[PDB]
Amino acid sequence: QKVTQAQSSVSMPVRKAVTLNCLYETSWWSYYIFWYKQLPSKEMIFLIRQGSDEQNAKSGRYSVNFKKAAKSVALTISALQLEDSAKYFCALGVTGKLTFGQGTILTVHPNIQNPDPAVYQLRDSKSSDKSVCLFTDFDSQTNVSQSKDSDVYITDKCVLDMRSMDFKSNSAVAWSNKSDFACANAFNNSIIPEDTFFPS
Template structure:
């Protein structure tokens, strides 16, 4: 079974604070892919990052960083020095080697991030 849990329903921070969004996943597959998407109020899902199960290196991209830990089945996302434009709903998603071909993702329930000026 594939499952993604985002325990934080909503987070509010003040601009320039750092914030970490948690993601815990469940899968029996040995090869799988993890994603983070951002959903602004306009509705479209904006791709942020994709990691495969064999690559546990943490990644930094500007103010964004991701911490992938297979031992705890977690793929957490940190925004450093948050900005008002970061306000959105963030989704963590999981796909397997089999389902990635079908664009079949298992999404978490999302974390709504509110960044206040």
């Protein structure tokens, strides 16, 4: 009994479809295959089940391409939405005793139709020594780099959805105690300054 997920990470844009592969080994003639997603809270969410003597499973946006001879149980997630970003686990089990694969992290990216990449200086807090910078409204293809200096902190890109306006945007934050720290320099390992808005 072994489950193998060769893909470590998969990235795909919103509204498209993705396929997560799974290969298994079992000495049983009859068995069940399961697909789970793990939330950032670490909670396990059942997605879909596939019986070895069943037709290809389908449950809403989830479908399985079960190939018995090859012992492969791929999962396709159709009409991808940002809420699908998670770590997906394939499992094999008989009578509830499940054995899990390595897992695949799926990152669903928004479609930024009108990008306006910019770097902003946020207003300081009366009760903090930190100065904060916001890199926002950039294209999903942009990778945000970690800082070189150990006293400068840069978060990875994050996506927020302003539901009422059907507006989605990417953002990364930079902060430091240092006097040398300016928003003009902060994200330069991630941007072409001439392609980015910098207010006066």
